[PDB]
Design an enzyme around this catalytic site. Structure first.
Site, short mmCIF file in Angstrom:
data_model
loop_
_atom_site.label_atom_id
_atom_site.label_comp_id
_atom_site.label_asym_id
_atom_site.label_seq_id
_atom_site.Cartn_x
_atom_site.Cartn_y
_atom_site.Cartn_z
N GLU A 173 -6.01 -10.85 -1.40
CA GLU A 173 -6.51 -10.82 -0.30
C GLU A 173 -7.84 -10.73 -0.33
OE1 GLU A 173 -5.00 -7.49 2.00
OE2 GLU A 173 -2.59 -7.40 1.77
N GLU A 229 0.72 -1.07 -0.19
CA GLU A 229 -0.16 -0.21 0.46
C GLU A 229 0.63 1.24 -0.05
OE1 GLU A 229 -2.83 -0.19 3.25
OE2 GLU A 229 -3.75 -1.83 2.52
#
Ligand SMILES: [Cl-]
Ligand SMILES: [Cl-]
Ligand SMILES: [Cl-]
Ligand SMILES: [Mg+2]
Ligand code: NA
Length: 354
Positions: free
Chosen positions: A259, A149
């Protein structure tokens, strides 16, 4: 009634020629029914939390390996591949990283000579973390989330980089150093990934694309892109998902879905059903349709997709419940997987096993 997950054909076996089937796990989940579901259906795992920076080096030179080791031992024991999550992130990362020698936050320093020293010190601490961690786990890890991220959801700067403490202090050099260090100690055969959410949507997707393209031009060893795929029933579209994976495949990179969860709700996730029993059947039927479409796309793109990991095992445990509660006054239940809270199959399972 819907049979138990261990009474049906294996997802891993079903998708054996296309990609690994993975699940995010915690150390306490490696036994009992969660253990039975894992062994039957999955050939890859990842640590949900046990391998994040703060979970491994809470204080400098003080390493807590037990959670991570337990997960690794389960992987070895059950011939599971293993993703590493994650070497670098702006959350679940210990405070001591970003303090100067005097014990004060590096972000408060104004003298430029000392800012430089703090930058080098931070990069050196990062290198030691990655060095130590990689040397311990390189023989077991089959994919590394080297950075997590690092791309922003907006455009605070023209490169769309997330302005975390890492960026504020080092610019993008922490990303470079992360990958260089990972490559150095993991070897040439290690698969290095940049992982992120909302990789399907613009402008974020284009900032990721540009970053990766710029770093590759400077010889930074990036092997693939991790698509977190924290998605919804109708969003993002199949074509947006397709387009994103094809763009990164065009740069010579691998894709992994890292994910995956298919929330029953929007963003934010309100209104949310208060309990699992309160979720209507028709929502699960809409989820199933979505799942069919997801896995036909995945199987269609299997040349450029090596692994599909769900961010959990069954509906009894999911971080989407935290999010539901957060946006619904402490009450809410999501249900993102193909297995229900008692490990019985859901409609979604039937729509991806066929
Ligand atoms: Cl801390
Ligand atoms: Cl469909
Ligand atoms: Cl059905
Ligand atoms: Mg299907
Ligand atoms: Na593949």
């Amino acid at each position: 009634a819907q049979p138990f997950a261990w009474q049906v054909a294996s997802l891993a076996d079903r998708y054996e020629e296309s990609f690994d089937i993975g699940a995010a796990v915690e150390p306490h989940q490696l036994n009992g029914r969660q253990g039975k579901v894992l062994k039957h259906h999955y050939n890859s795992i990842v640590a949900e939390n046990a391998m994040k920076p703060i979970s491994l080096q809470p204080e400098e030179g003080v390493f807590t390996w037990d959670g991570a080791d337990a997960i690794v031992e389960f992987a070895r024991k059950n011939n599971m591949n293993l993703r590493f999550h994650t070497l670098v992130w702006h959350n679940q990362v210990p405070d001591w990283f970003f303090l100067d020698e005097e014990g004060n936050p590096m972000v408060e320093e104004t003298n430029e000579a000392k800012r430089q020293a703090n930058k080098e010190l931070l990069l050196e601490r990062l290198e030691t973390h990655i060095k130590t961690v990689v040397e311990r786990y390189k023989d077991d890890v089959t994919a590394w989330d080297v950075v997590n991220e690092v791309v922003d959801d907006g455009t605070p700067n023209e490169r769309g980089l997330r302005e975390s403490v890492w960026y504020q202090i080092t610019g993008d050099e922490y990303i470079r150093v992360a990958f260089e260090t990972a490559r150095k100690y993991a070897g040439e055969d290690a698969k290095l990934f940049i992982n992120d959410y909302n990789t399907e949507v613009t402008p974020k997707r284009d900032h990721l694309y540009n970053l990766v393209q710029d770093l590759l031009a400077d010889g930074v060893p990036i092997d693939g892109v991790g698509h977190q795929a924290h998605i919804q029933i109708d969003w993002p579209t199949i074509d947006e998902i397709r387009t994103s994976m094809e763009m990164f495949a065009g740069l010579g990179l691998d894709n992994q879905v890292t994910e995956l969860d298919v929330s029953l709700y929007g963003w934010p996730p309100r209104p949310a059903f208060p309990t699992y029993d309160a979720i209507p059947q028709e929502r699960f039927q809409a989820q199933a349709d979505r799942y069919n479409q997801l896995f036909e796309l995945y199987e269609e793109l299997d040349a450029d997709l090596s692994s599909v990991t769900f961010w959990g095992i069954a509906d009894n445990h999911t971080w989407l419940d935290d999010r539901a509660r957060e946006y619904n006054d402490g009450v809410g239940k999501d249900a993102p997987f193909v297995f229900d809270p008692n490990y019985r199959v859901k409609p979604a399972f039937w729509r991806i096993i066929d």
